[model samples]
Target: GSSGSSGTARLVAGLEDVQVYDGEDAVFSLDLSTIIQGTWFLNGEELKSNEPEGQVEPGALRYRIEQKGLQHRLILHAVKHQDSGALVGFSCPGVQDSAALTIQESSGPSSG
Candidate 1:
């Protein structure tokens, strides 16, 4: 860290596509140079969490948001088979990222 560095809020790391089976949990995470407020979207709609702000308790909500300094994560709990091929995204004032969620068939008997 010896050069002249500009202070710009940007995504240092973006989201990655994830694959999971039915009733599994999928986590999407991103990193920023600065810790700030942001929005999480699912299928082009704003996602709402069931738990209270800054609390880790996962209630009846299917989605949860967690933040730790410069890193943020969206946790999809108990993903159903119908959730396959869904799009998830995160956005700030000047930065944004998106990813897909792929649900795979379970090794055991799968419901039709």
Candidate 2:
């Protein structure tokens, strides 16, 4: 017996909007009910976790991608002021989910 067909899939993010302070880490995740070929993107660009070229910000911005139990996650380490934008998780035969990450800097007293 042999049967093959595309199954329906839906994407969901663990966190919709991530607000992290400077010198902190931020994580964005998405899970799918059905397994399918897919990819993660930062600011509308394909991302390859093994390489540091596709990250939203290269300097002072480190990222890690993990896929566990049908759940995909993107983690940002040592976040800086420039690592702010949308992270999209796209999958075949399903709608992509996106999460926005904002880095807030603490206001300091004015110096002379």
Candidate 3:
């Protein structure tokens, strides 16, 4: 009763909406059919992560990627208000998913 081709990969669990405050990190994760890696995107633009895919290392420490077995995560460090409502995505061979990011101002009364 096998119907689909074995060459195709599927996304078992996709990203979920995240809410974080300014100066905090936002993490997005997903699960796939295999251990193969996926690309992360922000507002439809590909983001460079710490993972070396034969590409130049990013000049800043804005984004990073983490992998644990079949779970892949995207970490957005020190998020700012400008990052609010941005689109986050994960893409693998033959599979993709997306989520929304919401960044709010800090709830504390810290002064300069």
RMSD to true structure for each model, in Å: 6.5, 4.3, 5.8
Local accuracy of candidate 1 as per-residue lDDT tens digits, 28-85: 9998987566678766666554434433343544766886656889988888777687
If the candidates were sorted by their lDDT against the true structure, best first, what order would they fall in?
Answer: 1, 3, 2
How do the residues 1-112 of candidate 3 rate in per-residue lDDT, one tens digit apiece?
2244445467888899998998888898888775665678886677655443334355434777786545888888887777688789987777878999998876657876
Q: Which candidate model has the greater TM-score, 1 or 2?
A: 1
Steric clashes per prediction: 0, 0, 0
Candidate 2 pairs with clashing backbones: none
Q: Tell me the TM-score of each prediction against the true structure.
A: 0.73, 0.69, 0.72
Higher-lDDT candidate of 2 and 3:
3
lDDT of 3 at 48: 58
Candidate 2: list runs displaced more than 4 Å. 1-8, 12-15, 52-60, 85-93, 107-109
Model 1 has an lDDT value of: 0.75
Clashing residue pairs in candidate 3 (N, C-alpha, C atoms within 3 angstroms): none
Candidate 3 ranges beyond 4 A from true positions: 1-7, 50-57, 107-112
Candidate 3 local lDDT, residue 112: 65
